[PDB]
Amino acid sequence: RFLKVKNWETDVVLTDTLHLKSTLETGCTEHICMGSIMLPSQHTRVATKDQLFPLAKEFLDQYYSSIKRFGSKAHMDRLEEVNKEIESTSTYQLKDTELIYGAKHAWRNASRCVGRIQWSKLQVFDARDCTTAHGMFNYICNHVKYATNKGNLRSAITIFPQRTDGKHDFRVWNSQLIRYAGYKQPDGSTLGDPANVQFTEICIQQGWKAPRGRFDVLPLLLQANGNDPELFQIPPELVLEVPIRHPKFDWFKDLGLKWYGLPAVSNMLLEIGGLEFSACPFSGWYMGTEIGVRDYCDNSRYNILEEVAKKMDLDMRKTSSLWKDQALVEINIAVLYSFQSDKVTIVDHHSATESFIKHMENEYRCRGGCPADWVWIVPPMSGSITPVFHQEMLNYRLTPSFEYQPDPWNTHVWK
Numbered sequence: 275r276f277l278k279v280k281n282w283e284t285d286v287v288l289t290d291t292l293h294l295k296s297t298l299e300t301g302c303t304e305h306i307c308m309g310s311i312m313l314p315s316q317h318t319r320v321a322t323k324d325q326l327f328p329l330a331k332e333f334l335d336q337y338y339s340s341i342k343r344f345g346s347k348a349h350m351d352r353l354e355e356v357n358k359e360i361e362s363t364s365t366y367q368l369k370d371t372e373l374i375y376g377a378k379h380a381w382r383n384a385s386r387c388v389g390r391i392q393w394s395k396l397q398v399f400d401a402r403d404c405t406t407a408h409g410m411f412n413y414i415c416n417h418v419k420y421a422t423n424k425g426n427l428r429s430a431i432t433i434f435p436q437r438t439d440g441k442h443d444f445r446v447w448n449s450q451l452i453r454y455a456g457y458k459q460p461d462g463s464t465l466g467d468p469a470n471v472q473f474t475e476i477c478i479q480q481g482w483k484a485p486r487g488r489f490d491v492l493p494l495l496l497q498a499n500g501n502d503p504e505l506f507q508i509p510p511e512l513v514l515e516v517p518i519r520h521p522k523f524d525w526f527k528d529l530g531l532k533w534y535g536l537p538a539v540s541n542m543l544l545e546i547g548g549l550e551f552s553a554c555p556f557s558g559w560y561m562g563t564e565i566g567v568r569d570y571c572d573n574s575r576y577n578i579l580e581e582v583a584k585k586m587d588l589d590m591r592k593t594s595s596l597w598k599d600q601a602l603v604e605i606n607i608a609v610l611y612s613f614q615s616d617k618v619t620i621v622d623h624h625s626a627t628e629s630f631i632k633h634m635e636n637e638y639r640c641r642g643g644c645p646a647d648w649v650w651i652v653p654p655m656s657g658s659i660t661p662v663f664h665q666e667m668l669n670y671r672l673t674p675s676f677e678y679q680p681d682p683w684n685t686h687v688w689k
């Protein structure tokens with residue numbers, strides 16, 4: 275009940291006691307491990323007034339513990355204040371300070387995130403006064419421009435009004451603020467990003483005018499207060515894109531690949547002291563492999579191993595020539611080199627995983643643990659030559675937290 279994790283590259287052991295403060299469930303049992311189930315039944319998000327105060331008290335207790343005024347008079351009055359408000363309105367409203375804390379610690383607790391070394395450097399944009407889809411558009415544009423910061427990217431989150439009844443939900447329908455369109459072709463194949471083929475069509479059904487190419491930045495589909503969502507084009511001067519060149523292969527430019535600088539998840543739900551924030555887009559900067567391995571090389575994504583290997587003139591007949599592997603290294607050297615040559619913030623999978631081991635050390639020292647999801651923390655290439663491969667990690671669910679949630683078009687009582 276005071277568990278040990280080992281590193282088998284360094285023989286370093288750390289003792290995890292933080293997992294005792296865990297509340298939520300993982301999906302595993304004593305007899306079955308679900309650690310490679312992608313969206314486990316637990317990781318996805320109406321809630322009543324009785325359940326709300328334990329969640330508020332728990333959250334408030336750790337917040338005041340963090341400002342080193344645990345259980346003071348200022349704490350007990352805020353406990354009374356929120357109890358009374360959950361009497362009156364059967365819900366409550368976070369202080370600005372409580373919101374910034376909750377948000378930072380949702381990131382801090384995000385066990386699948388390898389970049390958490392940065393968890394306290396988070397800009398929080400309180401959008402809880404927003405009322406309209408145009409309001410959201412404005413807030414999201416300010417977010418993009420701030421977080422991008424001319425390529426010196428900055429981490430940020432924008433928190434739209436919390437869920438109330440459940441039928442008046444603020445939702446960004448985009449999975450990520452900036453994504454390329456997916457167009458299936460009349461001959462069955464797919465242009466652009468096959469991940470977004472459904473979403474790309476949803477936008478056209480609401481009226482989008484597609485410039486049917488590859489890297490067409492999708493418009494925003496913003497749903498305010500449960501109302502049918504509305505289309506908005508992010509000013510192109512706000513969407514920073516990196517053309518991908520290699521530092522050796524000049525035919526690499528003719529591949530005509532590019533990516534956006536800003537990774538900005540918009541479809542998750544932020545949970546703070548039992549309050550549910552259905553629209554909470556958050557952004558950092560990219561680890562190279564996200565674009566160069568997954569985005570470019572997943573069979574279900576751009577799938578460029580085929581044509582990259584061609585132009586390298588590779589032994590493509592035999593599986594064991596490792597032509598896929600060789601082509602995949604070049605692709606991620608190019609992604610990295612291109613972002614850096616433009617002063618656009620990006621991190622290589624070696625630097626990021628080393629920082630995470632450093633982050634784990636700090637969490638196990640000044641916090642007693644660090645929830646970590648090995649399946650997700652290990653990079654999708656060169657796994658064992660990064661230090662996280664050899665690092666035992668205890669996964670467990672802490673709160674505040676980012677949670678998955680259904681795609682809004684499966685759940686939105688429409689009109």
Ligand code: HEM
Pocket residue numbers: 377380381384386387388389390392396429430431556557558559560561564621626650676
């Ligand atoms: C600062 C630079 C950051 C880097 C380099 C980074 C890195 C990553 C990577 C590589 C992933 C895996 C993504 C995937 O495989 O799809 C991830 C996931 C995630 N990131 Fe971070 N991240 C950063 C900032 C942030 C911020 C600012 C937040 C929120 C405030 C955040 C929250 C999350 C969450 C919740 C996930 C997991 C999503 C899921 O469970 O599917 N990250 N991050």
Ligand SMILES: Cc1cc(N)nc(-c2cc(CN3CC(F)(F)C3)cc(F)c2F)c1
Pocket residue numbers: 450537538539556557558559560561564
């Ligand atoms: C803040 C941040 C930094 C960074 N480097 N990456 C991401 C990032 C996260 C995800 C997770 N998504 C939720 C899902 F499970 F649906 C897949 C998907 C992406 F495409 C990303 F770019 C986010």
Ligand SMILES: C[C@H](O)[C@H](O)[C@H]1CNc2nc(N)[nH]c(=O)c2N1
Pocket residue numbers: 310311312649650651
């Ligand atoms: C089956 C498995 O759970 C699924 O492919 C996961 C594996 N690990 C991952 N790790 C990260 N970082 N991102 C992912 O999308 C996935 N996908």
Ligand SMILES: [Zn+2]
Pocket residue numbers: 302306307308309
């Ligand atoms: Zn397990």
